[PDB]
Design a protein around this ligand. Structure first.
Ligand SMILES: NC[C@H]1O[C@@H]([C@]23C[C@H]4C[C@H](C[C@H](C4)C2)C3)Cc2c1ccc(O)c2O
Lengths: 268, 58, 233, 338, 233
């Protein structure tokens, strides 16, 4: 199965490289361009930083675990690796949820948007997205409240991880974007009568997250509830789907919108 | 009549502007280029002087 | 900056920047709105309703904890070509039309055409206010001045099915009102590109809920602007 | 009387143009082919000045060559320290539609004006520490489009009333009136000796006015569109002007001529602010197309591309010592370039 | 512009007292203020400094925690909380206004001064060559100041201050940085120094020049004063 190993390594190199380059492009674009210093662009930049750190830290060494079922490093580094993985993934999910909240206040409270969604509130959002996952991962794997490396998930631990890592920044995003879809449909119908892009945009934005992060979380919370029966291969595929969401997130939130595309073209 | 008064004012303005001393275009061009070349030494934008004397370093 | 004089200068600059941050918070929460019209249109009674050679008659009014700024240009000449790009980032432009005159109506229509098609005033929506509807109703019911005397297209005009009148009103008045609205609507929809929108309204000088209409229209304008920015419209 | 008067005025302008053509024999460009062009200049963003909420509409340099004041329609005149980027003053205005600002040559006063119809002069050196309104000059029907100090007690303004006014700060009323412009004047520039000034209106014609006697000394025409920017050549007998037709051009007072037009095919948006370097060899001109081009004033070629602004460039000006040029745009950011 | 101080009186040694300086006629919210003090038989000395927004606050070597400075912007006063009053802490304290932007004139106006009587290295040791000299009026007067360190900075500013307080009244400001002359003082004064030794010249002398002349450094920040040359007629 050497050819299979080589193909998987090539695919994972492709994923790691593309997430790294996309997130670096986004980071430099916001951190350099004076027109892209808006608070929502700060949320985008913090999200891209989270995915860039994820691709730099946890993807390259979770790569070796995949297709080999071995951890070449020690358990001491394994604890920090799992901590950083959980931290950065939950941080990315929280950043997606907070971007959804920002867009909710933008197109649901449009007049009181530039005031309520100021740089201070966005800084608080970034601090929460970086801190709550950090304390969660550190307290759940370092203080022992729960292949080469796999964390033992418990009945309480799995549901806790679902609620505080995926479901809240899940349901919140889902309800927000449902409201956004309803409002955008109403406005588009009104404009057409006074004489769809919104459905496609929200479909992409919600579908990427809900096809990458969702199945992984459903599997990892069904595993402790029922018997601990599952092929070890599926867990690697699902965590790599999460990493692939980290890959696509800069594309969804910065390369989809024409203003950022034009800024990038003006960069070159 | 306001219109005839405005016409008279315009005629007077053009008359006053017309009867003034002119110079050939060559002389004006020559003295402009002479001013440009003579003061080019003290023009920090024409020849970029080293940053040892520019107060806008870095 | 090592010197104490320079350190204190930097600290003074930091205090100035803090004051500028306070001013930025105040200015970013305030929506800027241009007000345009003509003589006897009704801009003055409108601006006094929500409450020398001066040029800007600044007005500030608060609706649902949202601050709106009326920028009325006064004591200035015509040909509003060179000062109109100052209002480039305003939330909207409220255009006031007197719908009773029927002789300055063509001039107001041309002014709306100029404002709507202005190259600088793109990305900026127009909130249209037709005033003196009581006077318009009185004039049309009196029959002193027929519409055909100035607008010949009124004969071949039909009231749209989505035209709701006031509960008690002559339907000739409603037809005239909606024809005058549809003129500006046709100007707006002739070339709008779907980036700025017109919000015609029927109102009078005594109509006190004009700030609420401005609030609703600005809410729709900013909501649509954000939807376009997010590629949702 | 109108019929004969119009024809005689038209004949007078015909004979003026005939004299203009007679005085025109050889153009400046073909005279300046022999001299070596400056070539290409690499000007970089030496400093970026941040703090304006809304877009910047005006800026000016001090005679001290260090401080500069910039106006934004968010109601702030920010007086900076150019080298240290620090803010010396942040004057809040009583009408946030300012398009003009003039830092006094002595540095004591700063002017502003715009849609407010009133030119506000602010004193900077006072017993109490604050920049209070020194005076409020009213009397322009149209919006103030430019203002320039002569000294501490005099200022010349050009307004939207198609008129310019020589003011007097002490009395507070107009001293001289400059009329004769069809369109509204949008910018005036002063001669170094401060005896005459050139103002450019939207009638596609600039005018040279004498401050003292107060009559239109010399009318210059040749533009197709509205004149937005004006600067006066350092020699004292020429000046550049910039219009909406994406073409700027140089005129000479004694020659009474339209010299070379610094026009290029790729640029299509008009000029907004124009200025000369210390020697007059360089001509900087901001454009509505995000660019601030630099032309060789004697070669009519784009001697370098000086982009770097994310919005319309509305301000410009070269430091009195010629060390650097400050460019203010609609991105609400000043940029000092060398 | 009046800097009125309140307090003073006989205070037992080791006690605590609050010295106040009320500011009227000028908004000092943009002013850093200095509590310079006058010993009964010595020269001026600086003890503490509070910024415009109180962001940066510095004290002297002899009094670091024993003194405490406060400013109340709404009340427009300075509060000086002094503790552990030793026999050295006797001085007619002066509250000093100093705005710190480019081209400003710090230490321009000084407080009236309230006497305080009680019962019983990195510091720039800059000394004035002489202490007393009788000079006839009219002809030029030369006063020499010397510093222990070069006062010229990398930015091109060489900080120096001259006061020349008239007998029995608050010190004024003559020259700052020995190149710029204050508004109130006549233009007849001038200064010149290489960076270590400095000289002040007077074109013509009158009864207003009677008094002792002082000399301040500002490059480093101990705010050490000069010995003082007393000019007697
Ligand atoms: N793909 C990110 C993802 O790592 C998982 C891990 C944790 C352990 C190491 C490795 C394989 C197993 C065991 C599953 C990754 C846990 C987790 C993640 C994201 C958010 C979470 O809230 C969370 O608990």
């Amino acid at each position: 199965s050497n050819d299979v190993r080589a193909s998987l390594y090539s695919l994972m190199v492709l994923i790691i490289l593309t997430t790294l380059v996309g997130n670096l492009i986004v980071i430099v674009s916001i951190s350099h361009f004076k027109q892209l210093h808006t608070p929502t662009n700060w949320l985008i930049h913090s999200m891209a930083t989270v995915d860039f750190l994820l691709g730099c830290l946890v993807m390259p060494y979770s790569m070796v675990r995949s297709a080999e079922h071995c951890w070449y490093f020690g358990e001491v580094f394994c604890k920090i690796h799992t901590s950083t993985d959980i931290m950065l993934s939950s941080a990315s999910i929280f950043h997606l949820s907070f971007i959804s909240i920002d867009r909710y206040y933008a197109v649901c409270d449009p007049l009181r948007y530039k005031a309520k969604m100021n740089i201070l509130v966005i800084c608080v959002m970034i601090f929460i997205s970086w801190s709550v996952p950090a304390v969660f991962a550190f307290g759940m794997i370092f203080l022992e409240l729960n292949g080469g490396c796999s964390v033992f998930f418990s009945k309480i631990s799995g549901v806790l991880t679902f609620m505080t890592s995926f479901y809240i920044p899940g349901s919140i995003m889902l309800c927000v974007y449902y409201r956004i879809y309803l409002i955008a449909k109403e406005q588009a119908r009104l404009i057409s009568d006074a004489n769809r892009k919104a459905v496609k945009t929200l479909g992409i934005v919600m579908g990427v997250f809900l096809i990458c992060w969702c199945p992984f979380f459903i599997c990892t919370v069904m595993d402790p509830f029922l018997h601990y029966i599952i092929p070890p291969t599926l867990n690697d595929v699902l965590i790599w789907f999460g990493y692939l969401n980290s890959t696509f997130n800069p594309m969804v939130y910065a390369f989809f919108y024409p203003w950022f595309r034009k800024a990038l073209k003006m960069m070159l | 009549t306001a219109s005839i008064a405005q016409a008279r004012k315009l005629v007077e303005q053009l008359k006053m502007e017309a009867n003034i001393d002119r110079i050939k275009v060559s002389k004006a061009a020559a003295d402009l280029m002479a001013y440009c070349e003579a003061h080019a030494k003290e023009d920090p934008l024409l020849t970029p002087v080293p940053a040892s004397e520019n107060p806008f370093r870095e | 900056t090592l010197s104490a004089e320079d350190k204190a200068a930097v600290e003074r600059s930091k205090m100035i920047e803090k004051q500028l941050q306070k001013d930025k918070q105040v200015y970013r929460a305030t929506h800027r709105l241009l007000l345009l019209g003509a003589d006897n249109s009704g801009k003055s009674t409108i601006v006094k309703q929500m409450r020398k050679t001066s040029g800007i008659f600044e007005t500030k009014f608060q609706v649902d904890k949202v601050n709106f700024h009326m920028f009325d240009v006064g004591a200035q000449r015509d040909e509003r070509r060179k000062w109109i790009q100052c209002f480039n980032d305003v939330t909207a432009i409220i255009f006031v039309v007197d719908s009773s005159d029927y002789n300055r109506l063509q001039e107001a229509l041309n002014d709306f055409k100029s404002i709507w098609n202005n190259r600088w005033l793109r990305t900026i929506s127009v909130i249209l206010f037709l005033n003196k509807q009581d006077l318009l109703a009185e004039k049309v019911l009196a029959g002193k001045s027929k519409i055909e005397d100035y607008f010949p297209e009124f004969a071949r005009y039909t009231t749209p099915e989505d035209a709701t009148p006031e509960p008690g009103e002559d339907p000739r008045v409603t037809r005239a009102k909606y024809f005058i609205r549809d003129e500006f609507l046709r100007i707006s929809t002739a070339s709008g590109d779907g980036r700025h929108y017109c919000y015609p309204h029927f109102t009078c000088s005594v109509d006190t809920e004009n700030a609420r209409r401005i609030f609703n229209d600005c809410r729709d304008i900013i909501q649509r602007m954000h939807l376009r920015q997010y590629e949702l419209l | 009387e109108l019929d004969q008067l119009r024809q005689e005025a038209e004949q007078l302008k015909n004979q003026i143009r005939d004299a203009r053509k007679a005085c025109a024999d050889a153009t400046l460009s073909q005279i300046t082919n022999n001299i070596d062009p400056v070539g290409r200049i690499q000007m970089r963003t030496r400093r970026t000045l941040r703090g304006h909420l809304a877009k910047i509409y005006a800026m000016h340099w001090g005679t001290d060559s260090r401080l500069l004041v910039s106006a934004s329609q968010d109601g702030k005149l920010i007086i900076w320290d150019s080298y240290t980027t620090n803010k010396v003053h942040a004057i809040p205005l009583r009408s946030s539609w300012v398009m003009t600002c003039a830092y006094a040559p002595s540095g004591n006063y700063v002017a502003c004006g715009g849609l407010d119809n009133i030119c506000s002069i602010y004193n900077l050196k006072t017993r109490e520490g604050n920049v209070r309104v020194s005076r409020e000059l009213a009397g322009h029907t149209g919006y103030l489009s430019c203002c320039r100090f002569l000294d501490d007690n005099q200022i010349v303004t050009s307004s939207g009333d198609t008129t310019c006014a020589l003011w007097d700060i002490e009395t507070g009323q107009q001293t001289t009136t400059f009329t004769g412009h069809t369109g509204d004047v949008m910018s005036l520039s002063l001669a170094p000796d401060t005896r005459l000034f050139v103002s450019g209106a939207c009638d596609a014609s600039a005018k040279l006015w004498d401050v003292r006697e107060g009559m239109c000394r010399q009318t210059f025409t040749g533009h197709e569109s509205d004149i937005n920017a004006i600067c006066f050549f350092p020699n004292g007998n020429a000046f550049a002007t910039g219009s909406d037709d994406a073409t700027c051009r140089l005129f000479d007072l004694r020659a009474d001529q339209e010299l070379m037009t610094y026009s290029h095919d790729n640029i299509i948006c008009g000029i907004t602010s124009v200025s000369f370097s210390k020697s007059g060899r360089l001509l900087l001109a901001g454009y509505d197309d995000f660019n601030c081009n630099v032309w060789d004033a004697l070669k009519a070629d784009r001697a370098g591309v000086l982009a770097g602004h994310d919005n319309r460039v509305s301000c410009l000006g070269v430091t009195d010592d010629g060390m650097a040029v400050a460019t203010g745009s609609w991105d609400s950011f000043l940029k000092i370039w060398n | 512009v009046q800097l009125v101080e309140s307090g003073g009186g006989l205070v037992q040694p080791g006690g605590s007292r609050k010295l106040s300086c009320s500011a009227s006629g000028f908004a000092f919210s943009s002013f850093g203020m200095h509590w310079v003090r006058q010993a009964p038989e010595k020269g001026l000395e600086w003890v503490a400094y509070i910024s415009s927004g109180s962001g940066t606050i510095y004290y002297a070597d002899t009094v670091k925690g024993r003194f405490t400075i406060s400013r109340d912007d709404p009340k427009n006063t300075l509060f000086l909380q002094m503790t552990s009053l030793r026999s050295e802490d006797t001085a007619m304290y002066y509250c000093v206004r100093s705005i710190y932007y480019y081209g400003s004139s710090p230490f321009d106006f000084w407080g009236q001064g309230t006497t305080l009587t009680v019962s019983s290295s990195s510091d720039i040791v800059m000394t004035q060559a002489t202490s007393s000299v009788p000079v006839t009026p009219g002809e030029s007067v030369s006063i020499s100041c010397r510093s222990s360190k070069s006062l010229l900075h990398s930015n091109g500013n060489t900080y120096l201050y001259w006061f020349l307080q008239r007998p029995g009244q608050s010190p004024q400001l003559l020259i700052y940085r020995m190149s710029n002359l204050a508004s109130g003082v006549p233009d007849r004064f001038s200064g010149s120094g290489s960076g270590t030794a400095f000289t002040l010249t007077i074109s013509r002398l009158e009864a207003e020049d009677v008094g002792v002349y002082y000399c301040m450094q500002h490059l480093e920040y101990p705010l050490t004063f000069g010995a003082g040359t007393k000019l007697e007629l």
